[PDB]
Amino acid sequence: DNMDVIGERIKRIKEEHNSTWHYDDENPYKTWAYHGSYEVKATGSASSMINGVVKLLTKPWDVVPMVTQMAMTDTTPFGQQRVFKEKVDTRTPRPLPGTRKVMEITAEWLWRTLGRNKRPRLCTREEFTKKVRTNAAMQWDSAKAAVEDEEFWKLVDRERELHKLGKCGSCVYNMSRAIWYMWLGVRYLEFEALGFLNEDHWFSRENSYSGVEGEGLHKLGYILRDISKIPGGAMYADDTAGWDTRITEDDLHNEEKIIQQMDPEHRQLANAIFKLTYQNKVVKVQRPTPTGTVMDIISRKDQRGSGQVGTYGLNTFTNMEAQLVRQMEGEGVLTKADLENPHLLEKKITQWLETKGVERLKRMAISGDDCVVKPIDDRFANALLALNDMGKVRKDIPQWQPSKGWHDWQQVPFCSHHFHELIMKDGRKLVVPCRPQDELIGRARISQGAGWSLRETACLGKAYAQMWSLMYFHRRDLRLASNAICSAVPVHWVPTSRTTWSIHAHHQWMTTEDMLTVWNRVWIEENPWMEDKTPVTTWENVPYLGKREDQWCGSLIGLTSRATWAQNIPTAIQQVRSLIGNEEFLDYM
Ligand SMILES: O=C(Cc1ccccc1Nc1c(Cl)cccc1Cl)NC1(C(=O)O)Cc2ccccc2C1
Ligand SMILES: [Zn+2]
Ligand SMILES: [Zn+2]
């Protein structure tokens, strides 16, 4: 089918592992082309490492089911195969000809709108090097060593010369030093050709209208509140089932239209990324066999490779396009007859885009596969023909059952959170991010690496605690647990690793600066929705959620076990201090 594009990559893998290369007839691949297997040592673990510092200071959550579940993520070849079979080995039916036509018209208009002020450009070796260096001082260490080796860049140049001839020899996606250099080299080449979407803020709210890039978790609630003021129907936030697996060959060709705005030298490189690694891909996946573990080499023409970071911007683009198409259907612009029609009237779609498209983009908050839409009316709730036909089937709901919208922006699911408007004691309002408290505690109790010292583990606990003090201060249990962790860890110990990989995280908690000072900077000084810049001088003036809402959202406040924990927390803090040693601590309780 496509061996002329993927053949050189498979030939190189096969030559490198010819001692154990074989065709396994028991391969479970149904929708992916299977090329072969070779022996590998199994990677991953059946369960996550536990952060003992966070665990010792959150004893009431030792029982809680969601907390116990989050520590059971299986990353072994058995776990990889399970996820692959249940989620990735699917085929999306091809959209109808009228659906493909409206998508193409909308994609061309959207790219033109997105590129009205900005022009695409190539990203560079020093840009990638700087990003890698700033992230290593938060594998990043391995990546920092690779960017400092001139042989890595000479390998990058050889692969770029193949891409310029329309060939690919080593850009393989993963579901010795040489293979790590080839993977990081593939990521560099992708960054060089498509990194501009992220680096130049193409999906910022000012540039894209719907986008939220660069806003930060602390600003998303304010944007949903601003959207709530636009006249129209309810706010809809439908979750797509496995968004990345529903990116069709038609979606990929619509995303590729951005190459039309590039300079010749950039278009050549971006066309190679689109054709060789996005629209044709070679993937490695581990699989357990009766006699050991193999690495399977598979390929397909559609879906995304999640590891690519160019996928965030392209997912945002395709979601903005799909939601505009759904809004057109709700408004009666797109009928069932149009979706089936190759010959639909292009001009009525163009006219709707040119007269109402930007206004309709302003009614949305879109981040990758996450969307919030406030349509002009509720007909949108039942406009499902185009959405299902485009392959974006909603998760856990019958295909034709109407979407449920929200009339309170505070109840809307966006980027794994919901948002509350709080009234401070001085009358000022704050709009804060929130999620089930068991998820926040469960995540903070997971360590990220093996062989970590008590220092590295305590510093990751401190990073989680400071993130809670800045984003989730309004949750009573989290402010208390945060104070306990910060009192148990040396004040000069710098938080390490990362609390989240989310694009919305700005990592203001990765500091040894006083958290109240940082809180003031984020919530008051730099908050554009805070008109009165009066600083808050004490945590007693930093508000909480309403007790009832805190309890509805997972708080243990009012339980006897929680009261016992709060009363005995100086004892647990002292136990952690005793094991850390004679360092400088501070009492935050
Ligand atoms: O860029 C990077 C990771 C990164 C680090 C070092 C070198 C390059 C990259 N990126 C990159 C690559 Cl390899 C290929 C194509 C395009 C890009 Cl831009 N990260 C985010 C940022 O802005 O800090 C963007 C993002 C997107 C999704 C989720 C989180 C974040 C934070
Ligand atoms: Zn390549
Ligand atoms: Zn909440």
Strand-pairing partners, residue 38, are 295
Distance 419 CA to ligand 3 centre (A): 6
- All residues at 6 or more sequence positions from 454 whose CB lies less than 8 Å from its CB, including other chains: 52, 53, 579, 580
Q: Using the structure block, give the residue that is written with the tokens 């066309």.
A: 271
Strand-pairing partners, residue 429, are 423
Q: What's the chain's length in residues?
A: 589
Q: Of 361, 261, 359, 381, nearest to 321 (Cα)?
A: 361
Look at residue 530 and give its three-state secondary structure. coil
Distance 74 CA to ligand 3 centre (A): 29
Residues around ion ligand 3, judged by CB within 5 A, are 434, 553
- All residues at 6 or more sequence positions from 360 whose CB lies less than 8 Å from its CB, including other chains: 324, 327
Integer Cα distance of 137 and 143 in angstroms: 12
Instruction: Please tell me whether residues 522 and 588 are part of one structural domain.
Output: yes
Instruction: Please tell me whether residues 293 and 162 are part of one structural domain.
Output: no
For atom 10 of ligand 1, which residue has the closest CA? 309
CB 363, CB 227: distance < 8 Å: yes
For residue 128 and ligand 1, the question of a CB distance below 6 A is answered with yes
CB 290, CB 3: distance < 8 Å: no
The values of phi and psi at residue 93, to 5°, are -60, 145
Integer Cα distance of 465 and 447 in angstroms: 14
Give the DSSP H/E element, type plus range, for residue 254. Answer: helix 249-255
Instruction: Please tell me whether residues 328 and 388 are part of one structural domain.
Output: yes
Residue 553 in marked binding region: yes
Distance 309 CA to ligand 1 centre (A): 5
Query: Residue 394 carries which DSSP code?
Result: B
Instruction: Please tell me whether residues 340 and 448 are part of one structural domain.
Output: no
Instruction: Please tell me whether residues 572 and 461 are part of one structural domain.
Output: yes
CB 284, CB 8: distance < 8 Å: no
Integer Cα distance of 446 and 419 in angstroms: 25
Which of 415, 435, 470 is the last residue before a domain boundary? 415
Residue 371 in marked binding region: no
Instruction: Please tell me whether residues 237 and 114 are part of one structural domain.
Output: yes
For residue 312 and ligand 1, the question of a CB distance below 6 A is answered with yes
Q: Exposed, middle or buried: residue 376 (CB in 10 Å: 0-12, 13-18, 19+)?
A: middle
The total domain count for the chain is: 4
Residue 22 in marked binding region: no
For residue 278 and ligand 1, the question of a CB distance below 6 A is answered with no
Look at residue 294 and give its three-state secondary structure. strand
- For residues 302-317, one letter each, b for 16 or more C-beta atoms within 10 angstroms of the residue's C-beta and e for the rest, the string is bbbbeebebbbbbbbb
Query: Residue 405 carries which DSSP code?
Result: P
Q: How was this entry determined?
A: X-ray
For residue 503 and ligand 1, the question of a CB distance below 6 A is answered with yes
For residue 470, give Cα distances in angstroms to 359, 483, 518, 520, 560: 34, 12, 8, 9, 27
Instruction: Please tell me whether residues 261 and 295 are part of one structural domain.
Output: no
Instruction: Determine the residue of 124, 128, 131 to mutate for testing ligand 1's pocket, defined as the one with the most ligand atoms within 8 A of the Cβ atom.
Output: 131
Look at residue 63 and give its three-state secondary structure. coil
For atom 18 of ligand 1, which residue has the closest CA? 195
Instruction: Please tell me whether residues 397 and 509 are part of one structural domain.
Output: no
For residue 76, the number of C-alpha atoms closer than 13 Å in the C-beta half-sphere is 11
- For residues 318-349, one letter each, b for 16 or more C-beta atoms within 10 angstroms of the residue's C-beta and e for the rest, the string is bbbbbbbbbbbbbbebbeeebbeeeebeeeeb
Strands 281-289 and 173-174: parallel
Instruction: Please tell me whether residues 346 and 466 are part of one structural domain.
Output: no
For residue 361, give Cα distances in angstroms to 370, 376, 408: 14, 12, 20
For residue 60 and ligand 1, the question of a CB distance below 6 A is answered with no
Instruction: Please tell me whether residues 86 and 183 are part of one structural domain.
Output: no
Query: How far separated are the first and last CA of the chain, in Å rounded?
Result: 66
Query: Residue 399 carries which DSSP code?
Result: T
For residue 191 and ligand 1, the question of a CB distance below 6 A is answered with yes
Instruction: Please tell me whether residues 114 and 23 are part of one structural domain.
Output: no
Which of 247, 269, 301 is the last residue before a domain boundary? 301
Give the residue numbers spanning the domain of 585: 42-76+416-589
Instruction: Please tell me whether residues 446 and 463 are part of one structural domain.
Output: yes
Residue 123 in marked binding region: no
Which ligand approaches the C-alpha of residue 475 most closely?
A: 3
Cα-based angle 270, 389, 257 (whole degrees, multiple of 5) = 20
